[PDB]
Design a protein around this nucleic acid. Structure first.
Lengths: 151, 363, 112, 57, 462, 57, 48
RNA sequence: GAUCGAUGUGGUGACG
């Protein structure tokens, strides 16, 4: 059959750039658990880090990051970045942990290492994630009206 | 009921978003063809070479449906790199915008997708250009958008342990005072970038990316922006919406002259100093040939077309012509083409088998 | 080439996955028609024009496979044995269906 | 007669589905004509009511 | 032209090659498994030394195919020859013993050492033996002559890990608990090169090409090149206990390290970074790889050890004509080509498809939105049908990749199905679940919004 | 490093008799005067003892 | 409770126009003020 | 509520 149409090859080896990925832009107490977290970071173990991280008490996180060794906070930042994308149930606790980290422990300290590219990726990720706020608000309004109709 | 032959010349489409381009490899006119396709058309003989499919998706002619449009395209270092921009605007609030880079495979003799970028900008892309200098070590692409940012993309090594590959990554992001970016251009050398932010023009150094200079005469927003070539390369020409054509001298950082000429098409000759401007008068389109050094036009022709001229192009003729007079000398280097509103292309002219014997048809 | 001594080879053509059920010359003899077991497409090889045309689609023909066929001596018709006792008549030059004939019971063989 | 008209191999739909084709084309879309299925579930129906009462607290 | 299949949106190795193996099988033994060694011959039996018994096991074969038990106490370091016919061993008595893999008594006994001996190995020529014992000395012996060729004494503590070189005869490397690794070689009576390790050296290995020596001490694994004498190219720590043993894959690129932390790390040599991990029940004393990566054997602190198994043709003179190959469309593509939008939507909501590939369902939802017939497909359904759609929306709306199209779909469903909300309690429950998910996502995004401001402050402070 | 080996009884005391721990269990428990080789085997079969292990393990 | 009634009552929009203007104004500036809230969180925590 | 010129309202091929 005669057709004067030429089709370029589109395969699965092509690089895809979405806004969320880096290339698109640019005294004996149980008050803390530092010694479990440090060797959970030295050896990447899912269960040990899940025991340490999955908490809710704020001052526990405060004292844990205070007593933590100062050359291993960056692995903690990687694990927070990895665990932030997920269902909100696990994500809210991780946001609380991150807020506890940057708010008090390293508000002055993190200015020193000059390692901003490591933090930049998390900035881009949470910049990308919040793009659907107003659509979610519209959906929430309609759902509230529908629920009003339910009762 | 199957197709045996096709008789077609230049494809008629409702709107030609891209300009008239010339593919360096085939010396053929490239523009919008079928919806989602770029037509490659031979200028010498009124025959269509082919259609190249950029978006490979089903098309339905049902009325009142928003369709994806291929808006911008450009050719990079010779014909090696092709950049395509597509968008869909179902509503004003949300836009789908996508950019694709195609590299030419010499062995395959076809294009293959290299890098696909989803949402490169947050608003419509207005300009697209490449660095055709060959003195620059790295190929460079610039995308400007109405969101107020222009982005500089560079080709970087993407090799890893598993496989060896190359890809495009973002290099620089620029803005000025939250103003929309309308036009962008490179100098002949690739050393300077001229980008128009609404009324004003800003000049950046491409090597280190700092804002070197700024020109703002309070006349109007810049419609067309171009650099001079060859012996007038020190000059920069700017046309405004309020019918003003002004020439800037980069060395003096001041404007040499300006005129009231409302131009819709301004194309710089690649192989000559001449600038040809198509001005939309009430009676019809008019043409002016001039050189940026001198504020007087060399040749003036009126009534070239009763209809509006929306695009034009200069094509380097392979064998140069000879015209001694300065009025006709602009015809020597290259041929000029222009496309009217009714999609008519106009230009300027001075003038046996062995089986016959095997099967015994010869008896 | 037909000679009692050697029979030299003129040309041989190999199709990809087309075991030939029946191949015959046309009545005038300029073209060769071939068919396969359990295949819909009928292959026509025009020697004078040097073109090999695969006729995969015949409009108005519901037959799933084309294997058994005959050609008229005068060269104006081509007849295809179908199923459910159906005989289909095709014009030789354009390969387009003219009409259909139905018999009671299966079609075993047919001739012009 | 039953197998010849409503048996396996025939192309039959339900009256609820057949009457719902018009609803998909109306200027204002509606749901199925008979929205409730009586015999889809009975135990599952009760738990939904139990969960609902809990939800208002 | 031709019909074009719908695009499937995508949202952004060693893992596949290192997980092909089947379920582990456990073999019980008595005593700790001090080492496991494979034989190069196509019968890939492995020798497991444990307590006073050296057991030879075949492929599978949970019972030992052979047993050498003539040891009064804790035999050491069974190692195969390149022919897979002889094996060297050690003992706490101090004698080096050659065994035939089909015999019952040692062929040659060497009596030089005074205390327990822990490392033995063959040479490039398959007729000499290198040993090192707990009396701080290493000896080189000849097999046919049955006498000691040479002695070296340059170590201050227990010498308990030795290696030899396949490429160069007389070139061998030994390791001790005195933290040093000394390389005795060539034809001379003194060490040509020495290497310092920070901790007692559990294991040493020689890379075949290029001369890379890998030493394992404590958590550290250090790489030393011989092109520049005593050049520490890289030191790696990825274990949280002592690195017990180190092995090299059949391909040179992969390197394996086992340790007390019950975890085995797989590294690439070109990149010198982790490419895979393995987890086990007990601490790995011994790690062994079969031909290619067919069998992986790990011997534990306890008795058990884990084994991880993985018509007619064209003639030359004929002219070739190529027939097109029939292309198979997916079922949803076939429905779309025939304009069966409702059937396509029903197909993508297959619970198999939703669980395994939600991306496909999202893709056809987006395509139906592009065609402008999403409302037609969504409308006209009963409570049982709409419950499945609402379940999919509940399960997948929170994900950022699917968020806009699913939000639009939820908008359309709400607009269509508002008037019939009172009849079905289950639809009400599904809507309540969706609403609660919506509030939780909004609150999470607000917390993120605060975090963006804090990070902007810290970034600009820099 | 902390690797604790399994304990091995070098001597045993059974029925006022000293049993060597380095013998195989079947031969080891024949040091009792009343017990012979067949009685040892039948007793160990009844008491499901692995016979490939020494008296010490 | 009364939203259904609010649907039946004609000419509802002009009566509640001021409340609509209020909500448009407040909703328009929520995200910037959330960023400022985070910044003030960091400042107040640092000071105290 | 139907109606004595009434016409099913209307979707896209092909090579084991």
């Amino acid at each position: 059959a005669i057709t004067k149409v030429r089709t370029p090859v589109m395969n699965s080896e092509a690089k895809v750039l979405v806004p969320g990925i880096p290339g698109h832009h640019a005294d004996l107490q149980t008050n803390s658990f530092p010694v479990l977290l440090t060797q959970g970071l030295e050896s990447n173990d899912f269960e040990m880090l899940n025991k340490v991280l999955q908490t809710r008490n704020v001052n526990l996180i405060k004292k844990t990051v205070l007593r933590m060794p100062l050359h291993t906070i960056i692995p903690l930042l990687q694990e927070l970045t990895k665990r932030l994308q997920g269902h909100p149930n696990s994500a809210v606790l991780m946001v609380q942990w991150l807020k506890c980290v940057l708010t008090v422990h390293a508000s002055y300290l993190s200015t020193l290492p000059d390692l901003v590219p490591q933090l930049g990726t998390l900035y881009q990720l949470m910049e990308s994630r919040v793009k659907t706020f107003q659509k979610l608000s519209h959906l929430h309004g309609k759902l509230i009206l529908l629920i009003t109709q339910v009762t | 009921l199957e197709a045996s032959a096709v008789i077609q010349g230049l494809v008629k489409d409702r709107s030609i978003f891209t300009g008239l381009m010339i593919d360096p490899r085939t010396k053929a006119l490239v523009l919008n063809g079928k919806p989602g396709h770029l037509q490659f058309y031979s200028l010498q003989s009124d025959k269509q070479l082919y259609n190249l499919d950029i978006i490979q998706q089903e098309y339905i002619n049902d009325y009142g449906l928003i369709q994806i449009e291929l808006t911008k395209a450009a050719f990079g270092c010779f014909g090696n790199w092709l950049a395509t921009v597509e968008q869909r605007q179902e509503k004003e609030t949300e836009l789908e915008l996508q950019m694709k880079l195609w590299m030419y495979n010499k062995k395959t003799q076809g294009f293959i997708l290299n890098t696909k970028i989803n949402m490169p900008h947050e608003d419509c892309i207005t300009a697209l250009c490449f660095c055709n200098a060959e003195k620059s070590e790295q190929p460079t692409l610039v995308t400007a958008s109405k969101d107020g940012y222009f982005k500089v993309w560079i080709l970087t090594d993407d090799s890893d342990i598993y496989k060896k590959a190359v890809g495009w990554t973002c290099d620089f992001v620029g803005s000025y005072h939250k103003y929309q970016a309308t036009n962008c251009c490179f100098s002949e050398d690739g050393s300077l970038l001229a980008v128009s932010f609404e009324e004003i023009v800003t000049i950046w150094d491409s090597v280190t990316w700092e804002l070197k200079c700024t020109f703002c005469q309070r006349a109007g927003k810049i419609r067309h922006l171009c650099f001079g070539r060859l012996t007038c390369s020190k000059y920069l020409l700017g046309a405004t919406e309020n019918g003003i054509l002004c020439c800037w001298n980069l060395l003096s950082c001041a404007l040499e002259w300006n005129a009231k000429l409302n131009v819709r098409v301004m194309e710089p000759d690649p192989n000559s100093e001449n600038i040809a401007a198509i001005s939309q008068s009430s009676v019809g389109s008019d043409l002016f040939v001039f050189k940026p050094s001198e504020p007087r036009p060399l040749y003036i022709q009126k009534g070239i077309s009763r209809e509006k001229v929306q695009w034009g192009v200069f094509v380097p003729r392979d064998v140069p012509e000879s015209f001694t007079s300065e009025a006709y000398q602009w015809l020597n280097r290259s041929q000029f083409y222009f496309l009217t509103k009714s999609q008519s292309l106009l230009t300027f002219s001075t003038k046996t088998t062995p089986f016959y014997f095997i099967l015994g048809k010869h008896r | 080439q037909v000679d009692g001594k050697t029979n030299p080879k003129i040309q041989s053509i190999y199709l990809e996955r087309f075991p030939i059920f029946k191949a015959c010359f046309s009545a005038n003899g300029e073209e060769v028609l071939a068919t396969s077991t359990h295949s819909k497409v009928l292959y026509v090889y025009d020697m004078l024009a040097g073109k090999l045309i695969p006729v995969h689609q015949v409009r108005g023909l519901k037959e799933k496979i084309v294997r058994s066929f005959e050609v008229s001596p005068d060269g104006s018709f081509l007849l295809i044995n179908g199923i459910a006792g159906y005989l289909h008549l095709l014009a030789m030059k354009t390969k387009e269906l003219i009409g259909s004939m139905k018999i009671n019971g299966r079609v075993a063989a047919s001739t012009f | 007669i039953h197998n010849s008209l409503y048996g396996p191999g025939t192309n039959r739909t339900t009256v609820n589905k057949f009457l719902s084709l018009a609803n998909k084309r109306l200027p204002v879309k509606r749901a199925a004509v008979q929205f409730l299925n009586n015999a889809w579930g009975i135990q599952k129906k009760q738990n939904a009511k139990r969960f609902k009462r809990r939800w208002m607290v | 032209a031709g019909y074009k299949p719908v695009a499937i949106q995508t949202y952004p190795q060693d893992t596949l090659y290192w997980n092909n193996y089947k379920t582990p099988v456990q073999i019980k033994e008595f005593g700790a498994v001090s080492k496991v060694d494979f034989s190069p011959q196509p019968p890939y039996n492995y020798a497991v030394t444990a307590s006073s018994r050296i057991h030879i096991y075949g492929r599978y074969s949970q019972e030992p195919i052979k047993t050498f038990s003539r040891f009064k106490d804790t035999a050491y370091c069974a190692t195969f020859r390149q022919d897979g016919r002889l094996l060297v061993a050690g003992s706490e008595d101090g004698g080096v013993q050659l065994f035939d893999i089909s015999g019952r008594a040692p062929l040659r006994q060497f009596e030089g050492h005074t205390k327990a001996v822990h490392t033995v190995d063959f040479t490039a020529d398959k007729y000499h033996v290198v040993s090192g014992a707990d009396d701080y000395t290493v000896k080189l012996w000849d097999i046919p002559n049955s006498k000691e060729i040479l002695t070296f004494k340059e170590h201050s503590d227990y010498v308990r890990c030795g290696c030899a070189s396949k490429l160069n005869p007389d070139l061998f490397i030994t390791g001790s608990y005195d933290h040093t690794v000394k390389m005795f070689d060539a034809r001379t009576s003194e060490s040509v090169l020495s290497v310092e390790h920070g901790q007692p050296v559990e294991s040493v290995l020689l890379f075949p090409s290029g001369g890379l020596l890998v030493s394992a001490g404590g958590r550290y694994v250090k790489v030393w090149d011989m092109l520049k004498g005593g050049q520490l190219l890289v030191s790696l720590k990825n274990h949280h206990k002592t690195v017990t043993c180190l092995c090299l894959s059949s391909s040179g690129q992969r390197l394996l390290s086992g340790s007390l932390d019950r975890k085995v790390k797989v590294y690439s040599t070109t990149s010198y970074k982790v490419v895979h991990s393995f987890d086990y029940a007990a601490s790995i004393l011994s790690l062994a790889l079969a031909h290619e990566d067919e069998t992986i054997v790990v011997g534990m602190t306890n008795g058990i050890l884990s084994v991880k198994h993985r018509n007619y043709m064209k003639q030359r003179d004929d002219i070739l004509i190529n027939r097109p190959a029939k292309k198979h469309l997916e079922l949803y593509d076939r429905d779309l080509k025939h304009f069966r939008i409702s059937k396509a939507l029903d197909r993508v909501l297959d619970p198999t498809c939703t669980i395994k590939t939600p991306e496909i369902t999202v893709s056809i939802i987006k395509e139906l939105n592009r065609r402008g017939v999403l409302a037609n497909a969504l409308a006209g359904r009963d409570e049982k049908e709409i419950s499945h759609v609402l379940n999919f929306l509940i399960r997948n709306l929170s994900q950022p990749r699917f968020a806009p199209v699913l939000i639009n779909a939820a908008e359309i469903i709400i607009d269509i199905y508002l008037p019939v909300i009172g009849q079905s309690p289950v639809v009400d429950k599904k809507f309540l679940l969706l609403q609660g998910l919506v509030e939780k996502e909004i609150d999470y995004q607000r917390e993120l919004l605060e975090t963006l401001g804090m990070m902007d402050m810290l970034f600009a402070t820099m | 490093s902390l690797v604790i080996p399994e304990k091995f009884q070098h001597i045993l005391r059974v029925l006022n008799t000293n049993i060597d721990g380095r013998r195989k269990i079947a031969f080891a428990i024949t040091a009792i005067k009343g017990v012979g080789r067949r009685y040892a085997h039948v007793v160990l079969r009844k008491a499901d003892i692995d016979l490939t292990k020494r008296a010490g393990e």
